[PDB]
Amino acid sequence: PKITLLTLIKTAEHWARQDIRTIEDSKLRALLTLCAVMTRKFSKSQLSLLCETHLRREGLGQDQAEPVLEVYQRLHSDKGGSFEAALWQQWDRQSLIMFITAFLNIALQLPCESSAVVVSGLRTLVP
């Protein structure tokens, strides 16, 4: 199966509605990759909104704004999956589960662009 943009979305849709509390680590690791790839499909200007929506959904305090944003920024700028690998090792299983579940749900709802000029023009094309 070819990993097109659409296939990537469809995959996120499926796993967003799954109970992943008792999946294998092999699939959990892949889901983290899915989150990283998806993060890089958003403009860097949307990371702050992604962080905001994450805090809101999971009911985290504003004290977690800095660390949650950092995770998204370093995923967005990750190369060779070095940070993604660190995140896997450093965090426990449950923490990764909740983070992944949150993102997959958020990602499908948030716009991938913030630029007003770009958004204004793209809205004229939407069927």
Place this chain on the structure above:
Amino acid sequence: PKITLLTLIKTAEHWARQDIRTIEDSKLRALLTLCAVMTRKFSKSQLSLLCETHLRREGLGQDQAEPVLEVYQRLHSDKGGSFEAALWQQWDRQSLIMFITAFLNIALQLPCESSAVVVSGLRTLVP
């Protein structure tokens, strides 16, 4: 209307099939924006394949690989729509229409990730 990843794909699907000869400059300009945004949803490592697929579809020789790749590279690394705007100025309508039609078609079929480790993992998640 919310410019999500899915909305972006649906807009590309629609306009890929449209005969965009005789359309207004406003919408033709917006389509160029769509191409630029869509280009940056591909990993840098896929630009070479995007170029190759472009040439083959349009029936161009390999002598056109360098100029076509340059366009995709500069769209990919564009900031503030600087290069995007220069394309509009420099290019004629037909050169721009042919490029847009070409891209919108090929983009929906090609993978947005090349890294075998990423692809291998994401493949295990596809429903």
